[PDB]
Amino acid sequence: SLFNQEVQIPLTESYCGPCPKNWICYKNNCYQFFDESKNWYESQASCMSQNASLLKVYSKEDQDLLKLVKSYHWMGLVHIPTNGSWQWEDGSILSPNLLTIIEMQKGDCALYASSFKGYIENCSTPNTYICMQRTV
Amino acid sequence: ESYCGPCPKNWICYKNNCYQFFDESKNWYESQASCMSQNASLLKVYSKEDQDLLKLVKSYHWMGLVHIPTNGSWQWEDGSILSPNLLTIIEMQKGDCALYASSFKGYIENCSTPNTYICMQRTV
Amino acid sequence: MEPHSLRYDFTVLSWDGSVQSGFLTEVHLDGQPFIRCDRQKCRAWDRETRDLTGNGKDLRMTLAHIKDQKEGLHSLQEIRVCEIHEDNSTRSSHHFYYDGELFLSWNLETKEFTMPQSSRAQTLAMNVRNFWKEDAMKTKTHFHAMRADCLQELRRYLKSGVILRRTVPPMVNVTRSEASEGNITVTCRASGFYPWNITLSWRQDGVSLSHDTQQWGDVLPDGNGTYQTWVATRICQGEEQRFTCYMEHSGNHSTHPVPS
């Protein structure tokens, strides 16, 4: 119901944002892909320098564009060894039924890959990375 | 600017182009009808700089590129020409339609073969 | 014990250089057919489609980059197999086959492609390797990820009891063939056994006869997934007492006399 049911016309169009200049805007989220390979710590530093975090996966519907992504990329998922549980940079939990986590290399960080996969990787291994900022 | 668009509310916005990806496999003709139903068209590739995000697309997908054998080159559904030095065209299957794949590849495919497809709004 | 295995296969075809629409995806669990997909129509569920059949589409694009002037049929097959052994060690292989011949493999230890010595094989492999390089298609990480997917799926099938391997002990039966010239043929048959590995042998006063003084069946399939074999030897009437059949199978061992 863009009107009262769904139809794509010039009148039901909106602006997406606010986002950093020339980022991807989709369903109130801003994304950018960085092709310079960095370790997890430097990827996190790079995103936070732009007032963003690494990719956080919270919804298959709101982030369905993640299905189309080629290759492997740092996201904001980190291991607490004390519990054996995964959480995001922001301290929130990994919600069930979002990611399949796959044991690849022993390590405490995860690479995002399509569709909704996390590959456990050595935090020190250089990789491309995805930054995310919520619009509001 | 901080704002991208204008675009349909649930579409991907990038450098003021509006995109969506469709998982339901359709032939070229049905993919083009489906994009036009959403006030769009199949993907048109016009700029490596403005559409650099197309480098990160997994797999192959219908785009709006068609062969008219009578004139004997590739053009977009809107009648505009394929600009040189944008796409490398690869012969995959004998056919008159092309699939987009990363990086800026076009794979010649049978127009009747069902495939996933990318829609883009006709550029402002 | 034989290891557990998971096998993924992706197959595409060209006719006169035209890559056909089909892409066949298969999953075999310990050699046994499990999942078959004809494009995205998968039969034994979102994971069946997503990513998995997608490997066939990538394969259609790989075959389009293989230069071959020979007309007619060509085929490209990608094969992935992981193994989990008794000791929890793992194997993995990742192979590409053109017209039924190996042309390219990925070695987990060197993190590198290996090609065969043939110059036509190396030309096929460089067509493919250069394609994958240009379009960033199949990096080191891809090969390690695909291996990690395979082992994680094998570990899930094993936990679930879907490939539950059972031991089936043999039935052993000894028979005597009539006394032509005062000699008898004693035959020892072991039937209905799993797994395949068995020891069977005639003994004289508890010592195993040489291979050459015995006659040997092959080990044949015996239905419901089991096997059968036999061993025979020629003795003198009077002597039946000295001769026994010795059987070892998955830690069972038994000795069977010639019956009266």
Q: Are residues C181 and C211 in the same domain?
A: yes
CB–CB contact C18 B102 (8 Å) = no
For CA atoms A51, A54, A58, A63, give the dihedral sign: positive
CATH code of residue C128: 3.30.500.10
> Cα distance from B101 to chain C (closest Cα, Å)?
9
User: Residue B31 gets which letter from DSSP?
Assistant: H
Q: How many residues in total does chain C contain?
A: 260
The DSSP call for residue C3 is P
Q: Is residue C226 part of a domain?
A: yes
Residue C197 lies in a domain: yes
Q: How many domains does chain C have?
A: 2
Chosen for mutation from B2, B23, B38, B120 (greatest number of chain A CBs closer than 10 Å) is B2
C54 and B58 within 8 Å at the Cβ level: the answer is: yes
- Which DSSP letter does residue C127 get? H
Domain stops at, among C140, C160, C180: C160
d(CA C225, CA B66): 54
3-state secondary structure of C237: coil
Query: DSSP letter at C32?
Result: E
Tell me the CATH number at C230.
2.60.40.10
Of C18, C20, C57, the CB nearest to B60: C57
Strand partners, C75: C13
- Indicate the residue type of C260: S
Gap between the Cα atoms of C230 and C173, Å rounded? 9
Nearest-CA distance from C69 to chain B in Å? 14
Minimum CA–CA partner of C46 in chain B: B23
Of the candidates A105, A123, A136, A115, the residue with the CA atom closest to the CA atom of residue A54: A123
Q: What are the structure tokens assigned to A6, written together?
A: 């769904």
In sign, the C-alpha dihedral spanning B37, B42, B47, B51 is: positive
d(CA C19, CA C38) in angstroms, rounded, equals 15
C95, C125, C160 - which closes a domain: C160
Q: Which domain holds residue C241?
A: 171-257
- Please answer whether residues B107 and C64 qualify as being in contact, where contact means their C-beta atoms are separated by less than 8 angstroms: yes
> Contact, B64 vs B42, CB < 8 A?
yes
Question: Does the N-terminal peptide bond of residue B6 adopt cis geometry, omega within 30 degrees of 0?
Answer: yes
The chain C residue lying nearest A119, using CA atoms, is: C145
DSSP designation for A46:
H
Same domain, C28 and C98: yes
| Domain match, C200 and C142 both | no
- What is the count of structural domains for chain B? 1
**Cα–Cα dist C123/C100, whole Å:** 16
C141 CB near a chain A CB, below 8 Å? yes
Based on the fold, state whether residues C205 and C242 are members of the same structural domain: yes
C-beta atoms of C50 and A115 within 8 A: yes
- Rounded Cα distance between C213 and A100, Å, is 60
Question: Both C26 and C137 in a single domain?
Answer: yes
Cα distances (Å, whole numbers) of residue C5 to C80, C86, C151, C227: 10, 12, 9, 21
Residue C165 resides in a domain: no
**Nearest one of A103, A63, A55, A97 to A79, comparing CA atoms:** A103
* SS (HEC) of C81-121: EEEECCCCCEEEEEEEEECCEEEEEEECCCCEEECCCCHHH
Sign, Cα dihedral of B51, B55, B58, B60: positive
Interface test with C, best of A97, A104, A125 (most C CBs within 10 A): A104
The DSSP annotation for C173-226 comes to EEEEE--GGGEEEEEEEEEEEBSS--EEEEEETTEEPPGGGSEE---EE-STT-
Count of pairs with CB atoms under 8 A, one residue in B, one in C: 38
Nearest chain C alpha carbon to B93 = C18
Do C141 and A105 lie within an 8 Å CB cutoff? no
Measured in angstroms, the resolution is 2.2
Q: How far apart are CA C20 and CA A31, in angstroms?
A: 37
Any domain includes C152: yes
Task: Report which of C31, C21, C25, C32 is spatially closest to residue C11, judged by C-alpha positions.
Answer: C25
> Burial letters for C7-40: b for 16+ Cβ neighbours within 10 Å, e otherwise?
bbbbbbbbeebebbbebbbebbbbeeeebebebb
Looking at this protein, which amino acid is placed at residue A42? E
* Contact at CB, C148 and A104, closer than 8 angstroms: yes
> Which among B3, B10, B38 has the least Cβ separation from residue A15?
B3
The answer to the question of residue C166 being in a domain is no
**Helix ranges (DSSP H) in B76-121:** none
Contact status, residue B105 vs residue B111, Cβ threshold 8 Å:
no
Range of the domain at A73: 1-136
Structural domain includes residue C25: yes
C-alpha C8/C-alpha C5 separation (Å) is: 10
CB contact under 8 A, A113 and C136: no
Q: How far apart are CA C102 and CA C34, in angstroms?
A: 24
Distance in Å, alpha carbon of B111 to nearest chain A alpha carbon: 22
* Residue C42 in contact with partner chain B when CB distance is under 8 A: no
Are C61 and B102 inside 8 Å of each other by CB?
Answer: no
Residues B27, B16: contact at Cβ < 8 Å? no
Spatial CB neighbours of A111, under 8 Å, sequence gap ≥ 6: A72, A73, A74, A75, A104, A118, A119, A121, A127, C141
Q: Sign of the CA dihedral C97, C54, A65, C46?
A: negative
Helix (H, G, I), strand (E, B) or coil at B4: strand
Chain A contact for B10 (CB, 8 A cutoff): yes
Tell me which DSSP letter residue A18 carries. S
Alpha-carbon distance of B53 to A34, in angstroms, equals: 11
Nearest in space to C79 (alpha carbons), one of C30, C151, C28: C28
Q: H/E/C letters for each residue in C47-84?
A: HHHHHHHHHHHHHHHHHHCCCCCCCCEEEEEEEEEEEE
User: SS3 letters for C132-147?
Assistant: HHHCCCCCHHHHHHHH
Q: What are the CA-CA distances from residue A10 to residues A16, B5, B42 (Å)?
A: 15, 11, 18
Q: Are C157 and C96 in contact (CB under 8 A)?
A: no
Q: Which two tokens stand for residue A99?
A: 């990611």
Determine the residue among C46, C51, C61, C138 to mutate to test chain A binding: the one whose Cβ has the most chain A Cβ atoms within 10 Å. C51
What is d(CA C212, CA C116) in angstroms, rounded to the nearest whole number? 40
Query: Which residue's entry shows tokens 């020979």?
Result: C70
Q: How far apart are the first and last CA of chain A?
A: 23
- Secondary structure of A63-131 as H, E, C letters: CHHHHHECCCEEEEEEEECCCCEEEECCCCECCCCCCEEEECCCCCEEEEECCCEEEEECCCCCEEEEE
- Asked if B99 and B61 count as a contact pair (C-beta separation under 8 A), the reply is yes
| Selected residue of A33, A72, A121 to mutate for chain C interface (largest C Cβ count, 10 A) | A72
Provide the Cα torsion A136, B5, B11, B15; round to 10°: -100
Under 8 Å between Cβ of C62 and C19: no
Which 8-state DSSP code applies to residue B77? T
**Nearest-Cα residue of chain B relative to residue C134:** B103
Element containing residue B99 per DSSP (H, E) = strand B97-101
